[PDB]
Structures are given as structure tokens and as C-alpha cells.
Amino acid sequence: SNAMEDLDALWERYREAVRAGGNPQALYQEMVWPALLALWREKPRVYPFPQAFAVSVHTLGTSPEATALAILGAGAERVYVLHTPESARFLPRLRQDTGKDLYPVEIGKSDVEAIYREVKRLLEKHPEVPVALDLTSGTKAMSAGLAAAGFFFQRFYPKVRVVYVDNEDYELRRPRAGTEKLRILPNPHEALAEVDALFAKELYGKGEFGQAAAYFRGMVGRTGNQAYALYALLAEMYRAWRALDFGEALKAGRKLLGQLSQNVWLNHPLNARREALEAQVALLEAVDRFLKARDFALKEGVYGLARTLLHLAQEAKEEAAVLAALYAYRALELLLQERLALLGRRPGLSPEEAEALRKALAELLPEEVRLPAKLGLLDLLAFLRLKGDEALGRLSLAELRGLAGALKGRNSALLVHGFDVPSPKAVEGIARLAQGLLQDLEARTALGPLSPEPVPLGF
Amino acid sequence: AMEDLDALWERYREAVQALYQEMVWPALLALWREKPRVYPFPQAFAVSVHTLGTSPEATALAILGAGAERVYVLHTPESARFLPRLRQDTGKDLYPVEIGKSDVEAIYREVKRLLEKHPEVPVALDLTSGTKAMSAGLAAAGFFFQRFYPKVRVVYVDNLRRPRAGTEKLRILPNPHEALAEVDALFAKELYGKGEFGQAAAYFRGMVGRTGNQAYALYALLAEMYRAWRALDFGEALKAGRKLLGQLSQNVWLNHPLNARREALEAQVALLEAVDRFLKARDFALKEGVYGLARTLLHLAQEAKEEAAVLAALYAYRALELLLQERLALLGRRAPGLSPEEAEALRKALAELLPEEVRLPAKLGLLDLLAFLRLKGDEALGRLSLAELRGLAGALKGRNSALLVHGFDVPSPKAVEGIARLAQGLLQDLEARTALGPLSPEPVPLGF
Ligand code: NI
Ligand code: NI
Ligand code: NI
Ligand code: NI
Ligand code: NI
Ligand code: NI
């Protein structure tokens, strides 16, 4: 590699020329710079891994040489030079040492805002190709602004990379001739493994449990730390729980508690809220078992199911009305059914009862109106309240008559058997009624801490 | 105090580098000590972190300017020889931390540790001194961590051959969003790409509020149309689509990027119109609205298949039910159109499928409706293998048995999958018998 060799020889000759005592600036300009330029012309030195760039953008200040090296090292077809007004005079020489067509763009020395604007415009212009942002030359504000722009815009233009010419200083108070290397400045997200936890925590606070679980699981692979696995389990539980997959939720929670039990994890932050987690997993057990059993005697399973549905209805209430009404309807139906289970039957209708019920329903809304084989929602209200039901007897008639409209419409909704779009006031009425019943049932149940919200992550 | 510094600078230029030291330095120092000059708007800092390269003076002025009680100095091997002068000029004790000159990841690690140590106080990250990799690294770390430590700020000392002594200003470096409002736009696009249509709509609305441009109001109407569509509120979706279409008709917007997809857009809005008609009439003669409703429900089922299997089962059940009901409308029947020879024939058909004493409810269920439609030689259903009808029979019986309707079952993914495939075939058949236009399926690309 002769160019490299005759260059090292020129560096030692330079050493002796400055040891003799000449002004080393001109001795560098004549002795060294054309051989270094030659070395980078023939074979650009890039690290850590070689890359192809379609576009390169370069801040420019006092030192044209390093920018020339950076242009040659990125090897882009299209080249932009973000330069201060003073350094425009350097652009012909920059054009000559480099042999590229340059696109100059003038920027004030303190104008960081303009750096941001120029990067944004340039990425809108080149949105699908690898782009190199070279911060080597310029004021601290220009270079830091370019790096900050690159890393920020990587979120929307993932082929952007930030680069710079790393020079190592080695008597001769100057970088050694052949040691400069074009490097990629690593993104802080890339370079810090554990910061994924921050992202995960953020996503956990907003209830996006699946994505938080993904961040935790991948962090296990990257950093090799198994504590995050536990966090993953937790998020997955809350995902399966919110998805009404109670079996998957219970499985994940049991695995999590079994991990929290080992001595190796006694100091895991999740052990600080261990009581609440055991209460929640207990809820999951009760619900899973009640789903298998369909027995309305197990009050705790009915409670967990209904409460989960009501939580989902309240979360859907503003942006997904039809969904919300579906959830709320199933909750209220379950709760009324447990009320009936307090009595004898699930169908046990005597004719004195059937007649008295036609009376009750008729007086509510015409006694000719007929009653179906399985009891409706308002049907169920009338049968239970007709039997003086404590929480259903407390009902106000003003509310009752306005609910009556919503209660007939349960199977008639878009997502069950009909085409109704729900009236939001009807959704709120169903939800409020369901909530009062949920509270009465909660009173006659054996409950843990009763913590609705997911557990705080502890870090 | 500062006028005095100016007098010293004119006297400097007249007496004209060590004379910059002796003449000017302690007066500049003293100006920064007495009242530090911080811009654009001053503030207090609890923690200060400084990279240190070859220029200890600017770092001294930065340490004074930030006014922090705890000062961390991130220095190179060489830079250690500057630590006394720093302590002498600032009059502060310093926590030194050694770094390599291009060890950027050690800068990132240090900032991370220091922010874990000080999570709820204003922290100034000063990049004035250091290699390009050190300063760029500190700025990058500051802006990245700002999302999780909002009180972090990045700062720097802003500057004949020397800069005039009184003009140095400790400045706060803005992050890109602070300096460029329009990037909230980019955020919108990302949300729009992920399906969170409401948040995209709100973003575009705010952009109209600030920039005063109505094109982003068109984008907001687009996102709101898709949000209402996804929520199965076809009235509001039809509303927003109508208005937007009327705008893209107007001449003021002839170059709007959305017009670049108008042929798709129109079709979708027509679809909404059809659906609205159907929903008001409950009349299965309106084939277009049936197709639009069933297709929306099937898209929702597919997007919920992985994570929300219960919800996806509900969606797919409703789609399949609507499609079978339309197949029934072909024969001019509904839901009660039974005669005894037919009911018995269906008992024998169903029993042969699954024991010939089965009960048929008054109103037909999914499996009952399907077998009945075979008993009437309906074409699309008639070309099912008896094997796959046996394999679908279980999932077809659980129509009202699912957790989200009348029962408690969790779906097997094969059951939801098979019901969604059956409904898909019926949907293609109905697609032949409608004219819904170009009908691009996914949301139209924003066009920027
Ligand atoms: Ni040679
Ligand atoms: Ni990550
Ligand atoms: Ni979401
Ligand atoms: Ni919640
Ligand atoms: Ni039903
Ligand atoms: Ni989709």
C-alpha cells in the first residue's frame, strides 16, 4: 500500500522539519496534507462497520481539511455543506480536494434553529436513503445541534446516522497522519441497554402492557439480566387480564409469584408490593374457576369478572361507545344474575309468579305484553325488585323509568344481535347501575387489599 | 462592574495573549460571580455537569453561570491538569470523573447515573469544552433523557481574533421540538400510521390552531373519519368523510396531498354512505352496506386476533351472522319462515352432520342457519366439505355462548380463525354482487 507508506515517511520527515524548527502549519500544509488526502482518496477509512450513504450533510467552520476527509469517507453521491458565512471562501478548495459537487447552505455560527430546520428539510427531501450527518467542523453549538437533530429525527428517518472524524493526538502537538477515522456516533438508545426499562416503565404507566412486556423481554436478551423477565411476566399478566384471558393471566401471575418466592429475587422491587400482587392473583384464580364452574355462589369470581368488564367499559366509554355498551351490558347482566342466584333459581317460574310479574312489568311500562323463556335485563329487574331485593328495591322510580329504555336494547345492540348505536346517557346509566351492584357484591365478598390499578413497578 | 470591564477592554486593545489573562480575566470572572449572565431566561440549577477538554476558562464561566451547588466535571486524562485552576476560578468543590476522549458511551453512562442520583431537580449539562464527540455526546444524552427527566437542560457558553470580553452568554440549547413546532406534525403521522386515529386528529387540530393552515384541518378530518369508522360509529365517519370530500372538491386545495388519492377516498366515503343506509333501514336488500359492515367487522376481528381474542371472536361472530343473514335474504326469508317438512329435513341434515333427535330452536342459530341454507342449495355455502363443516360445527354452536355475549367461553384461536375464514369466503361472494368502487382497503396514506 504505497500511498500509506510514502505518507508515513512524510510524517517522519515532518517530525524532523519541526524538530529543526519551522512553523509547523505550513510544513503540514505542504508536507502532509496532500499525502493524507491521497490516502483518503484511494481508500476511505471508516468505522466500526463500513456503510454506504446516498446523502451526507456537513457542518463547516474553521477547518476545511477534516470536512474534506469526512466527505470522502462517507462517500455519498449528494453532499450538502452547512457553512458559516466566513467559511464560504473554503468551498472551492473543499470542492477541489474532494472532487464532489457541493450544495452549500449558509448558516449563522450560533443559529442552532437553522441547523434543525435544514436537517428537517433535507430529510424530507431524502426520506428513504441512508443519510450521514457529519459534525466534525463547526462551533460547539452547530455540531451538537447537528447530532441532536440526527438522533431526534432517527425516530422518523431510521437510516440517518451521525458521523465525525475521530483524530487521535500523539512533541508534535497534532493528530498523527494516518490515524483519523470516520466514526458513527452511537445513538444513546443503542448504546445504553438498560434504558429500555425507562421506555417499558413509560408504556406500563399508560396501560400498554403488551409493548412494555416486549421491551422487558427484549431487554432480557440484550443485557442478560433476568430481573426484567419478572417485570415482563407482570406486564403479560395485566395484558391477558385486560384481554379477558383470565387463564393466561393466572398462569403468568403464578409464575411471577413463584419467582418472587425464591431467595435470589427477595430484593426484587416487585416484592415491595407483594401483598397486592397476591390479592390480584387470588382474584384471577377466583375468576378462572368461576368461568369453569358457572356457579354464582362463588361471589369472588363474579366480582372479578364484572369489575374487569366495568373497568374496560369505562376505558372504552369515550372513544369506543359501542364496545363500551357491550362490556357494560355483560357486567350488569352478570350482576343481576348473581342477585337472582341469592334466591333459589337461575326457569323456576310458578304461575302466581308469572302473572304477578306480567303485572309488575306492565305497571312499569299494558298487561298483554308477553315474557320470554330466558329473562331479559328489565325482566330480571322486575322479578328481583318485585321480590323486594335490597339493592334493587332501593332504586328510584325516576331513574328506573329512564333506565327502562336502555335495558331493552341489550341484545339489540350492533355487536350482539341488532344495529343500535348506543346513547351515551344509556351507557352511563347501565354503568352506574352496574357499579352500585358491584359495590354491594363487594361488601359481601372476602377481599384482599382491593387495589384496582396495576402494581407500581418499584423502580 | 461591566462598564468597568468595557473600559478594561478598550484599554486592552490599546495596550496590544498573557496580557488577556492579566488585564481582562479577573474582571470577567468577577462579573460572572457577582451576577451570572444566563439567557434567554435565567433560572436556578441544583446540579451541574461539565465536559472538560482544553479550555478551562469557558468551563469556569459555565460553572459560575449555572450556579449549581453540586458540580460534576467530566474530564479527559490530560484535562486533569486543569482541575486546580477551575476550583480556583469558580471557588467551588468539584466531583471529577475521568473519561476517554472519544468514549461517548461512558459519557452516556455517566449522565444516566447522575440523573438517577438527581431525578427531580434542574440539571444543567454544559458541553462548552471537550472533543467534538464529548460535547455531541453530552447534548445527545441530555435530549434523549429529557423525555424521562424533564428538568434536564443542555447549555453552553456562547462566544480581532479574541471575542470581546463582555459578550459571553451562557445559553440553553433548544431541543428540536422546542425550536420546530411543525414537528408535532411528524408525531401525528406516526400516530396515524399506528392506528391511533384520535390522537392524530387532535395533533392536526393543534397544528391548525397555531400555524393557521387549513390543510392540517383536512388531515384532522381524515383521522377523525377513520377513528369513527373504527369505533363502528358510521354516522360520524360519514359526516367527516363528506365534509373532507367537499373540501378536496374546492379549488383552494387542488394541490393538497390528499387529492393525490381522491379516487380511493371517494370510494371509502361511498362505502360509509351505504353502511349508514343499511343501518337505518335494517334491510338486507342493501348489499353494499352489508358488505361494508361485514368488512369493517372482519378487519376489526383480524386486528384483535393476537391480543384480544375474546373481542375478536365477538367481531367475527357478528360478521358471519350478517353474511349468513344476507344469504338468507336471497331466498326472501328472515331470521320464522319455517314449514314442518323443512324443519324435519333440517333436523335430519344437522343430525347427520354432527344422532337424529336434535332440537332446533325457534330462531335459527349460526350452525342451524348454515345447514338450512345448504338444505336450500345456496351456492357459496353448498361448496363446503362435510369435514370442515364438522370442524366448524363446534365454534358455530358457541355464537351466544361466548364470554362477551351470553356465556363464558374463551375462544380457541382455531375457532376464531375458522369463523373468520368462512366469513371471508362469504364476503368475497358478496363483493362480486356489489359495486363499491376502487375501495382501497387500508387507510389512505397521508401524502407527506
Ligand atoms: Ni512509493
Ligand atoms: Ni430499545
Ligand atoms: Ni393504544
Ligand atoms: Ni385502567
Ligand atoms: Ni343474544
Ligand atoms: Ni388494518
Residue numbers in the entry:
A (entry chain A): -2 to 167, 170 to 345, 349 to 367, 371 to 464
B (entry chain B): 0 to 15, 22 to 164, 171 to 346, 349 to 367, 371 to 464
Q: Could you pull the original sentences from the published paper?
A:
In type III-A CRISPR–Cas systems, the RNA-guided multisubunit Csm effector complex targets both single-stranded RNAs and double-stranded DNAs. In addition to the Csm complex, efficient anti-plasmid immunity mediated by type III-A systems also requires the CRISPR-associated protein Csm6. We report the crystal structure of T. thermophilus Csm6 (TtCsm6) at 2.3 Å resolution and show that the protein is a ssRNA-specific endoribonuclease. Csx1 has been shown to be required for the interference activity of a type III-B CRISPR–Cas system in Sulfolobus islandicus. Both Csm6 and Csx1 proteins share an overall architecture defined by an N-terminal CARF domain (CRISPR-associated Rossman fold) and a C-terminal HEPN domain (higher eukaryotes and prokaryotes nucleotide-binding domain) that contains a conserved R-X4-6-H motif.
TtCsm6 crystallization was dependent on the presence of Ni2+ ions, which allowed us to solve the structure using single-wavelength anomalous diffraction (SAD) phasing. The protein crystallized as a homodimer, consistent with size-exclusion chromatography data indicating that the protein is dimeric in solution. The TtCsm6 homodimer resembles an elongated X-shape with overall dimensions of ∼120 Å × 70 Å × 60 Å. Dimerization of TtCsm6 buries ∼2800 Å2 of solvent-accessible surface area per chain and is mediated by two dimer interfaces, one involving the N-terminal CARF domains and the other comprising both the 6H and HEPN domains. In the TtCsm6 structure, the floor of the HEPN domain cleft is lined with side chains of the invariant residues Arg415, Asn416, and His422 from the R-X4-6-H motif. The Asn416/His422 side chain pairs from the two HEPN domains bind a single Ni2+ ion in a tetragonal planar coordination. As TtCsm6 and other HEPN domain ribonucleases are divalent metal-independent enzymes, the observed Ni2+ ion binding in the putative active site of TtCsm6 might be an artefact due to crystallization in the presence of nickel(II) chloride. In SmCsm6, the R-X4-6-H motif residues reside in an α helix, whereas the TtCsm6 R-X4-6-H motif adopts an irregular loop conformation, suggesting that the TtCsm6 active center might be distorted as a result of Ni2+ binding. Consistent with the observed ssRNA-selective ribonuclease activity of TtCsm6, the width of the cleft would permit binding of a single-stranded nucleic acid substrate, while sterically excluding double-stranded nucleic acids. Taken together, the structural features of TtCsm6 dimer thus suggest that the protein contains two ligand-binding sites: a putative allosteric ligand-binding site at the interface of the CARF domains, and an ssRNA-binding cleft located at the HEPN domain interface, which harbors the ribonuclease active center.
